[PDB]
Structure formats: C-alpha cells, structure tokens
Ligand binder design. Structure first.
Ligand SMILES: OC[C@H]1O[C@H](O[C@H]2[C@H](O)[C@@H](O)[C@H](O)O[C@@H]2CO)[C@H](O)[C@@H](O)[C@@H]1O
Ligand SMILES: OC[C@H]1O[C@H](O[C@H]2[C@H](O)[C@@H](O)[C@H](O)O[C@@H]2CO)[C@H](O)[C@@H](O)[C@@H]1O
Lengths: 233, 233
C-alpha cells in the first residue's frame, strides 16, 4: 500500500506507528528541528531492544540515551525531510518538513520500489555522513536490518573483539529462507559503489551475507543479530 | 502505475520507450558497462532538442556527441543501477544491473512517491559528482525539468552571459499554473541542503522559481527553457 497525508500531525503519528512495529532496526533521518518531537519515540524503540540508527544535521544532548539500548548517530548536513524506515519493510517520509510542518506531503508505504529507492538514498547519505555516537547497551543482541550499518559496526569492532551472528536470510542459489549461525570472520565494504557484506563462518564454511537487494553474495538478509564475544558469560 | 520486470531486455526496452517520450530533459545514471547499450538512444534524444543529463563512473569517447544537442555529463563512481528519469514524470530503474544483466528486478513508474524518492537520490549523487562535459548545441533552447541542473548551468554561465527564460510552473500562493518569461538575474544553490532556485526578473518583479516539490520559492517548475543572450540574432 501507499498512505498519503497533508497533515504534519497525521504524518508524525504514522511515523510513530511505524517505529512501534519495529523488531530489528529503524533508520531515522531527521532535521534537527524535529529531534525533540521524536525523542521519546526513539527512547521507547531502544527500550524494546530495537536498534535506532539516526542521521541528523547536529548532534543533540543525548544524556537521556545512556544505557537505553543499541543507538548509532551519524551527522549529515542536511536533509530537509523526516524519513523513517522500519525493518526494511516500510517507510514513512515527510517531504520538506524543515520548510512546512503544517501541511507537507507525506507518505507511508511497503512497496519494494519505494523501499529500493529510499534504501539507495539512505546509502548515499551514509557515505556522506560521519559516525558521532555509538551506544551498545545490549551487546548480547545487536540487531540490524540494513547490512551496510551492520558491516560498518563489524569494521569498527572485529579487530578488537570476536563477533558472533544469527542471520535469517534468503539463500540466493536455492531461493529459500534459512537461518544461519556462526562467527563473523571478515567483511567487504566498498563504500564508493555501496557493495557491503559480512563473511560468516558457518558449519558449511565461510559464506558472504549481503543486504537488501543483494546479488553477488551467497545470502541476502534483512534480519541480522550480532552477539559480542564474551557478552553472554 | 508501476510496471515490473525480471528481464534485462524488457527493462532496457522500457528505458528506451521512456526516453522516447521526453520533451524537456532526461536524467540518466548508468554504470559505464552499459553506455554502449544506450549510446544511440542518447543521441536520438539529443537530436529532438531534449537535454540529456548523464551520470557515469567513467567518461566514454563522446566524439559522436559533437553538436548533437544539449548534453551534460557528470562523473560519479559508482551507482550499480541504470536509472532514467524523464521530464520529472516517470522513472525506469534496473536494480544492480552491474551484477545481473540477465534477470535483475526492474520497474517503471509515474507515482510521485517514487519520483520524490529518486529525485532526492539523484540530488545526493549530484552533490557527490563532478561536471566533466557540457555541450550546448542549441543555445536558443536549453531545456530542463530538474531545477538543480538548471541552477548549476546558471551558476557556471551567468557571470559571462545574459540568460533569458521561459518557465511554466505552479504559483505556490494561488496553486495555479502560469507561464513566465524574463531574464535570470541570480540564483540560490545551497548544495549541502539541496535548496536550489533561479531568481527571474519578470514584468511583476524578481521572483524565485524552485524545482520539483518546492516550498519556499514563489513558483515550482519542472518545465524550464533558457535562451542565451544574443543567441537568437
Ligand atoms: O550484491 C551487491 C550489493 O547489493 C545491494 O547493495 C545495493 C543496494 O541495494 C542499493 O540500494 C545501492 O544503491 O547499491 C548497492 C550496491 O549496488 C546489497 O544491499 C549489498 O549488501 C550488496 O553488497
Ligand atoms: O523549496 C525548497 C526546495 O524544495 C525542493 O528541493 C528538495 C528536493 O525536492 C528533494 O528531492 C531534496 O532531497 O531536498 C531538496 C531541498 O529540501 C526543490 O526541488 C528545490 O528547488 C527547493 O529549493
């Protein structure tokens, strides 16, 4: 479906309703003007164990976020739209919110063509951003739907800590859904062309797990859980 | 509508059919692998007086393009999808074409939510690109649908040449369609936040004309024609 509105209030309610449904990760791109509007909906999302991956033009006071969950903040100056993408399944977009908050066009959709287009947009923003904050409140259960965020996390931590994974994804040879477990032993992150995957050692050998829309890897996944080595002991 | 395919051949035919309908401008983002596939469809588009704004990871041999029309090429390393957006009205996208050309998911749509998402994607690519070629074969009739491309052109030429315009667009106060004529006397291009407009001197004073989805300007337009000063004499 596509749901449409010209009420900022209605759109923000749809945004909140979308975040409330999240099980793994929400990616939020927001003008800093609207951080206070969504701050508590962030907090409540983190408190369910869902990852929040925020993009914002100025880093706010994040005192309140201490220990609340798994939270990543990247600085990107500047997108004038509020975007939320939940579990890679649904997006809510408020267009040009910086300039009209009020009556802007907004939409919510699960259509894969819209998700592809926005996934691609978010990856360009990712390339154009800098990581400013990472809080890993739950190192036994670090969830992602976006493999490029998962791989960025691997890149920053693998040299110092072992990282285990549970992944549900599509076997690109057979087309069937599988659940894999094992140890992350490497990764590919070719930033400029947006190729990204983890190399996961399983009982069947080391396989490559790509993200949404993957082609070259052995698996495609939007359901990723990492477990830091030693965290469960 | 949304049209979908898993045939590269079918998708390329849809891409060609979309370009064939263009009246003002086509934006094409292509891996360089596919330039030869679309080269002649570029040429034929230019020969109708339509602007081609190409993004590509490596600049090809463009000998053949000499004098053919109004052609802009920007280098961007690298997008793995073929995207064509025609007149701001329709997009065709072939996902991950670099890796599968063959059976990739492709789509064609006129839905404004898809156009908004891809317009936004293309603007990020624009920010991340460098202009490598500009050929102005028809200086009396330089057409655009994308105001950020039109403003980039103004930025590079206004100091050296007068530039006149004919614009059809929506008056953002009245909501009605108008046709405006006059002289371009300035512009706004705030690259990092993607604000872009021309300042057009009309018989009613100097007005700001923004592009698709504009809010802060006096007009929104996807139907822009520039005429270089002295070109008609
Ligand atoms: O199998 C190759 C990669 O495919 C996808 O990456 C795409 C992404 O879907 C798209 O939004 C973006 O614009 O381009 C990249 C690369 O072409 C997977 O998400 C990746 O994990 C794969 O590496
Ligand atoms: O009126 C402000 C600007 O609105 C639009 O620009 C948007 C664009 O639609 C969107 O795709 C992009 O991501 O952000 C920009 C800026 O918020 C018009 O196209 C512009 O011409 C206006 O300046």
């Amino acid at each position: 479906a596509i749901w449409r509105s010209r009420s900022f209030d209605e759109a923000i309610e749809m945004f909140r309703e979308s975040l409330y449904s999240a099980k793994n990760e929400v990616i939020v791109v927001t003008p800093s003007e609207f951080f206070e509007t969504i701050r508590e909906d962030l907090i409540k999302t983190l408190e369910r164990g869902v990852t929040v991956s925020l993009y914002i033009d100025k880093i706010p006071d994040l005192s309140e976020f201490k220990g609340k969950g798994n939270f990543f903040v990247r600085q990107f100056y500047k997108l004038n739209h509020l975007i939320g993408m939940t579990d890679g399944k649904e997006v809510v977009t408020i267009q040009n919110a910086t300039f009209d908050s009020i009556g802007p066009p907004s939409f919510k959709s699960t259509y894969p063509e819209i998700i592809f287009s926005q996934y691609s947009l978010i990856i360009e923003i990712f390339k154009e951003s800098t990581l400013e904050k990472e809080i890993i409140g739950n190192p036994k259960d670090i969830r992602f739907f976006a493999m490029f965020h998962a791989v960025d996390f691997v890149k920053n931590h693998l040299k110092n800590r072992n990282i285990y994974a549970e992944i549900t994804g599509k076997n690109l040879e057979s087309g069937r859904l599988e659940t894999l477990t094992g140890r992350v032993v490497g990764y590919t992150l070719s930033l400029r062309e947006a190729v990204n995957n983890i190399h996961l050692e399983t009982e069947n050998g080391v396989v490559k797990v790509g993200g949404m829309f993957a082609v070259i890897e052995d698996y495609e996944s939007t359901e990723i859980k990492f477990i830091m080595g030693g965290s469960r002991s």
